[PDB]
Amino acid sequence: KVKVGVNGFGRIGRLVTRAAFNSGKVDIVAINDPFIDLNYMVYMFQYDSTHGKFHGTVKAENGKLVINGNPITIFQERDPSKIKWGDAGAEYVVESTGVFTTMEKAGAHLQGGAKRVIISAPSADAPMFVMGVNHEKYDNSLKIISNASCTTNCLAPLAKVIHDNFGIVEGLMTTVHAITATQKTVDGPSGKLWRDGRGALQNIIPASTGAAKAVGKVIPELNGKLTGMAFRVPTANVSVVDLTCRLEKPAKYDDIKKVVKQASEGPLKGILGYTEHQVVSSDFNSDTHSSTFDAGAGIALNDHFVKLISWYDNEFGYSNRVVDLMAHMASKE
Amino acid sequence: KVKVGVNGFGRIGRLVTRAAFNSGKVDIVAINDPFIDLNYMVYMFQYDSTHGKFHGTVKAENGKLVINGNPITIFQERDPSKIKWGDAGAEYVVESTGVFTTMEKAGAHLQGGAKRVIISAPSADAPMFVMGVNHEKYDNSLKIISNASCTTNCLAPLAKVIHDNFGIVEGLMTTVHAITATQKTVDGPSGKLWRDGRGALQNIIPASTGAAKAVGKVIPELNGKLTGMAFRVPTANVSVVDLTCRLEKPAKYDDIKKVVKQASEGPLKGILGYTEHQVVSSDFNSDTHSSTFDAGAGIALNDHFVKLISWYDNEFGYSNRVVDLMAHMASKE
Amino acid sequence: KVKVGVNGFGRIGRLVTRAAFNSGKVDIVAINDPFIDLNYMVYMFQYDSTHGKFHGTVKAENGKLVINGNPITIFQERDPSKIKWGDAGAEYVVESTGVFTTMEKAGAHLQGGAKRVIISAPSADAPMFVMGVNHEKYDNSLKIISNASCTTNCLAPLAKVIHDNFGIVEGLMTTVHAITATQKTVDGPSGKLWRDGRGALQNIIPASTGAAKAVGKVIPELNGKLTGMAFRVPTANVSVVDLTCRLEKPAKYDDIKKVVKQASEGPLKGILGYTEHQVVSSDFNSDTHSSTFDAGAGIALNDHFVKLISWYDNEFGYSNRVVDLMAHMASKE
Amino acid sequence: GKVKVGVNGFGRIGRLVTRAAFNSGKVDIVAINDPFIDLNYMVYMFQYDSTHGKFHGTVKAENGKLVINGNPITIFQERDPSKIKWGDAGAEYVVESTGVFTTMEKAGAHLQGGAKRVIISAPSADAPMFVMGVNHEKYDNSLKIISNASCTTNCLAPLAKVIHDNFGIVEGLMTTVHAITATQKTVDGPSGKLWRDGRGALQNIIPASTGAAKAVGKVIPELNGKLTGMAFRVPTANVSVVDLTCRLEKPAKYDDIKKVVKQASEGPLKGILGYTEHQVVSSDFNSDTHSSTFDAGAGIALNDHFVKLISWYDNEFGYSNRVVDLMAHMASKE
Ligand SMILES: NC(=O)c1ccc[n+]([C@@H]2O[C@H](COP(=O)([O-])OP(=O)(O)OC[C@H]3O[C@@H](n4cnc5c(N)ncnc54)[C@H](O)[C@@H]3O)[C@@H](O)[C@H]2O)c1
Ligand SMILES: NC(=O)c1ccc[n+]([C@@H]2O[C@H](COP(=O)([O-])OP(=O)(O)OC[C@H]3O[C@@H](n4cnc5c(N)ncnc54)[C@H](O)[C@@H]3O)[C@@H](O)[C@H]2O)c1
Ligand SMILES: NC(=O)c1ccc[n+]([C@@H]2O[C@H](COP(=O)([O-])OP(=O)(O)OC[C@H]3O[C@@H](n4cnc5c(N)ncnc54)[C@H](O)[C@@H]3O)[C@@H](O)[C@H]2O)c1
C-alpha cells in the first residue's frame, strides 16, 4: 500500500527493494544512486553473490526500472534535497547511503515532498525503533526515524525477553560479524579506523560497535547496563551475537530456552527465532528473522551468569525489518 | 640436551620440530608417522603454507631425515607400543597424533622405551601444565603429562594475572578460532559433532571447548569459576580469546593494562605479551607468545565487569611451549 | 518411474537425491552410507552450506528416511556385496562413494539384486557416457557404466559443438575448480598427490585431470587431440573450463557464439547453456546446466586459434546429469 | 644506495618497493607522497603487513619524517602530483604507484616538482615499457618517463623469451589465475565501467581482461600480434600463476623445454626467471622475488608442437623488486 523511495542502491537499498517485492508489504516507486545508471541497476538487482538471482523479472523500460512489471522512477542526484520524491509519488524514503544519518542531513528528503524518512542505520539524534521491541512507541508526529543497526535488531529482541523474565543486571556482547562493503580486499587506507583497513580475507579484525549501548535507548531499563565489541571475520554474510549477562532472578538454562521458545511462537514470531538444531552460519543465509536463539550453542556457568548465542542474516533480516516498520507506520496513518 | 621423539608429524609435530631446531632447547632424534614416508616428510617439513619455507636444510640421507645436518630415525607404525623409541635414543616423546590423549593410550610409548610422554592436547586424566602458570608443579614422578590446549595456554596466563591482582569471581570465555585439520573443506561426515562436519571455508561454526574449565585445573583457585565455547571461522591460523569476567576487587581498565604490561615485561616475558597497537590476527602469525593482551580491543562496563581480549598463534605459540616444557622437565631430571 | 538406490550419501549422493526429488525423473527408494545413521542423514540432507536448506520435507519415520512423504530404506554396509537392493526395490544403483569405481567393485551391487549400476565418477574400465554427447551409445547390454566427471561433462558438450562446426585439430584445457571433499583445511597428508594435501583455504593448487583426455573417449574423433590440467582455488563451489584450441575451418568469434547459442536452444537445451551476461562464479550456484558458454570472457587470437570459457556448478550440474542418464537408461526398457 | 627515489602512492606496490629498496640497498628512498596516509599512519602501514609479515628493521615518526632503519624520509600529502617538491627532498627518480597517473602526460607532472625521471609501476598507453631480463638493455638516457609493465607481463615475458629463442612461438594464448587486488570489492558493489570487477572478491571466480599478453609483443617485438590472453581473479590475497598455451615452430620435447628453462634460470635470467620440479602451491611463492618461476611438474604437452607452460609469480613482491632493479639499471646509464 504505502509508496516508497530508496536513497542509495547498496546492499541495503537493493535488499529492502527485494524484501518489498518478495513480501508485497510496500510499493517501491523511486530509487536514487548517482554511481549506478539504469542498465547497471538491472544487473545489480538481478544478480547477487550472497542471495542468488532475483526470483521475478527485472528490465529497463522507457528509462524506468521494471521489477515484476511494476515501473520505478530513477534519480542520478548527488544531493538529497534536489531529489523530487514528490513528483514520483513516494510517501516514505529509506535513507540507505549511510552518509545522511542525522535528523538534519536525513531531513533533506522532506524538501522533495517526502512525507516521512527511515534511516537504514543508527542516528546520532533521530528516534530509533526495533520491530518487536519499541515499535508501538511510534506515532504520527515522527517524520524522521531510524531502524537502528542490524546488530541492535539482533540483540534487542533477545535482551527484551531475558530482561522481562530474569532481569539483566549487566551484559557484555561480542558480535562475530561477516565482512562489509567498508572493508578492504588487501591492506589499504581506513584513516580513522586503522584495523578496518587490513585485508578482510586474511584477518580477524576487532572493531567498536554502538549496538549494545543502543539497546539501552530502545529498552530504557537497560540504559548503561550493556556494552560490547565486534570481530570482523572472513565470511560474506551472516553474523552471530554472543551476550554474556548476569541475571537478577535465577534462570536455569532450560527456563531460558522455555521463555525464548514461547516468545518466538507468540508476540515475537518472525522477529525472534528459536532453534535446537546443530546450525552453522550458512543455515541463516536469507533467513528473515532479526535474531535466532541457538539453544545448543549457549552455555551457563550457574543460574545467574550465562552466555546466549543468537544468529542474524545482517543483510536480509534488517532489510525485512525496514519493510515491516514502514508497513506498521502506514497501518497507523 | 634431552633427546625427543615426535609421534604424529602434523601441524604440531612439524612445528615442534621447527621450534626445537630454531631454539636448540631439545634435540629431535626420531619421528613416527605411518601416513608420511621419509621423502614426504622432507617436503611437508620444508614447505609450510602458514609459516613459510624452513630456514635451514632438510634432506633424506641413508633412510634418515636430516635437518640442519642432524639425522633423525623415521618410524612408520600405527601402533604406538611398537615404536622403538629406546633404540633411537628418544627419552621424551611428544604425542601429537590427536588419537592417544588418555594416560592409558599415551602410556603405550613407555613399552617402546620412552621415559616420559608429553601429550600435545588436553587429557581426561594426565596432569596438565601451562608454562608460566603451574609448570613448577611438575616433578620427576610424572611420566605422562599434558601441555593442555592452545586455548588454555592463551587464557591461563591472562587469568593468572587478573586473579593474582583483582580476583576472578566468575568468567565466561569465547574463542574465535582458526580452522584446524579436524574440519572439512565442504559439508561432510563428523558423526559425533555434526556442526564440525560443515564446510570450514563457508561457515562460522560454534563448538564446545574444555579450555576455560581446564584453567581451573592449572589454577586450582579458579576451579568451577570459568567456562566457555568457541566459534571456528575461515582463517588458516591465529585465534583470539574474549574473556568476560566479574572481578572480586574493583579495577579501572588502566589498572588492568598496567598489571598485564608488568607481567609481560617480568615473570611472564615470552609467554604473555602486551600491545596497544591496532593489531589484527595476521600480526600474530609465527608469534611465539602463548597469549598477547590487546589493550585497545578490550572494554569495561564498570570496575567489576570487563571483557579482555588476547591473541594467540594456536600453532606456533603452543609448539614453542611444548619445547619449553620438555626443556624444563629435562632440567629437573 | 525407475526405482534407484544410492551408495554413498555425500555431496553427489545427497545432491543426486535432491535432483531426483526436485525433477521427479526417478524414484529414490534406498540409501547406503555406514558413516551417516538415519538421524544424521536427515540433518545432512536438510541443511546444505552451498545450496541452502532443502525445499520440501525430510524426517526419520519407522526407521526410514522420508523425503516429500516418500519413504526410503536405509542401509549401513561397508561391503557393497551385502546391500539388499533387491528387497528394497532398487533397480539402478548410483555408486557415489568415490571408492568403488571399477567394474569389479561396482559390480558387487548386482549380488544384492540391483540390475544396473551408474558410477558417479570416471572409471578405469566401465564405459563412460555424457548426456548430449554419447548417451545414445548406451544400450541394454551395459549393466555397469560411468557418468564421467563433472569436468568431462562441462568440456564434452562444448567440444562437440566446436568440433562439429569447425573441427578441433588440437586443444589444451585448464579448469579453475572449486575445492572438494578430498582436499584439506590445513597442510596435511595426501598419499601420492602431495600438492592436494596443501591447505585448500590458502592455496592455488595445480592438479592432474583425465577430463580432457576422457573427451576423446565420448567423442572418438578427438581421441589424442585434447589434454589439460586443473587449478584448485578457494571457492566452495562452481568451476570454469578454459579450452584453448586450434580449429581446421575458419571461425570468427561471432560464428562461434552463433553456433553455441543455437546448440543451447535446440538439441543441447538444459545441458549446454549460453550467456552474454557479465557473470561470475556465484551466478552459476545451483545452475543445473553441464556447461554454460561465457561469450564475453573468451578471446580469439585469430580465426583458427581461440580460448573458450564455460562455467559449471560441479556439484549440481553433474548430479542432474546422473538423474537424466538413469531416466534415459529407464526409457530403453 | 646511489639514486635517490621518491614514491608516489604508498600502497601495496609503494610500500613493497620501499621494503625492497631497504632490503637490496640498490636505491635510497628519500621521499614519499600519499594524501590518504599521514605520517603516523605510514609507520603502522609500513611496519605491519598481512601478506609479507612485520618489517624486519625499525620504523618510527620523528620531527615530521618517516625514519626507516635510521634513514629519514620526507613525507608529502598532495593529491596533485605537479605540487610535490621532489627536488627539495633530493628525489631524482619517482615511482608512480598510485594507479591514476599512468600516461606520459599525467606521470610527467613529477618533473614540475624537480624529479629527473619517472617509473610508472603499471602499463602505460604511451610510456615505453620495460621488463628486466627481456628488454631493459633498450632503456637509454633520453627516456625521462617509462613503465615497468604489469606483474603479469613480468611473469610471461621472461618465459616467452626463453621459449621463443629456442623453439619459436607461432602463436600463444595465456590465462592468469590471479590473486585479488585493491581495485576489487569485499561484497557486491559499484564498478560502473567493469561490472564483473564489482562482484564480491571473497565469493567469486571473476573473469577479467588483461593487456599483458599483447604487451609481451611490445617488449619482444618478434612476438608482436602472436599472443593474447585473459585473467581469472580468485579469492587469495597474493600470488598468481600464468598458464601459456603455445604452438611452437620447432619440435620441443617437454624434457628439452625443461632443460633450456633451467639453463636460463641458472645463467642470463638468474633472479628473474626461476625453475622448479618441486610439488609447489601458490603459498610457496609468497615473498619470492622472482618475476616468473617455471613449474616443470604442472605443465603438460599434447605433442612436440603444442604445450601448456605454468609459471608462478608473487604479483606484489617480484614486481616491487623489479621496480628497484630497473631504477638501479637506469642510474647505471646516467
Ligand atoms: N550491509 C550490512 O550488513 C548492513 C546492515 C545494517 C545496516 N547497514 C547500513 O546500511 C547503510 C548502507 O550499507 P550497505 O552495506 O548497503 O553499503 P553499500 O556500500 O553496499 O551501499 C551504499 C550505496 O549507496 C550509494 N551511494 C553513495 N553515495 C550516495 C549518494 N550521495 N546518494 C545516493 N546513493 C549514494 C553507493 O553507490 C552504494 O551503492 C550503512 O549505513 C550501513 O551501516 C548495513
Ligand atoms: N593445530 C592446532 O592449532 C593445535 C594446537 C594445540 C594442540 N593441538 C593438538 O595437537 C594434536 C595434533 O593436532 P594437529 O593440528 O597437528 O593435527 P594434524 O592432523 O595436523 O596432525 C596429526 C598427525 O598425526 C598423524 N597420525 C595419525 N594417526 C597416527 C598414528 N597412529 N601414529 C602416528 N601418527 C599418526 C597424521 O598422519 C598427522 O600427520 C591434536 O591433539 C590437537 O588437538 C592442535
Ligand atoms: N563434488 C563434485 O564436484 C563432484 C562432481 C562430479 C563427480 N564427483 C565424484 O562423485 C564421487 C563422490 O564425490 P563427493 O564430492 O560426493 O564426495 P563426498 O566425500 O562428499 O561423499 C562420499 C560419501 O561416501 C560415503 N561412503 C564412504 N565409504 C562408503 C562405503 N564403503 N559405503 C557407503 N558409503 C560410503 C561417505 O560417508 C560420504 O558421504 C567421487 O567419485 C567424485 O570424484 C564429484
Ligand SMILES: NC(=O)c1ccc[n+]([C@@H]2O[C@H](COP(=O)([O-])OP(=O)(O)OC[C@H]3O[C@@H](n4cnc5c(N)ncnc54)[C@H](O)[C@@H]3O)[C@@H](O)[C@H]2O)c1
Ligand atoms: N598489487 C599488485 O599486484 C600490483 C602489481 C603490479 C603493479 N601494480 C600496479 O601498481 C599500482 C598500485 O597498485 P597497488 O596494488 O599498490 O594499489 P593500492 O590501492 O594498494 O595503492 C595505491 C595507493 O595510492 C594512493 N593514492 C591514491 N591517489 C593518490 C594521489 N592522488 N597521490 C598519491 N597517492 C595516491 C592510495 O592512497 C594508495 O595508498 C597500480 O597501477 C597497479 O595496477 C599492482
Ligand SMILES: [Zn+2]
Ligand atoms: Zn576392472
Ligand SMILES: [Zn+2]
Ligand atoms: Zn521398464
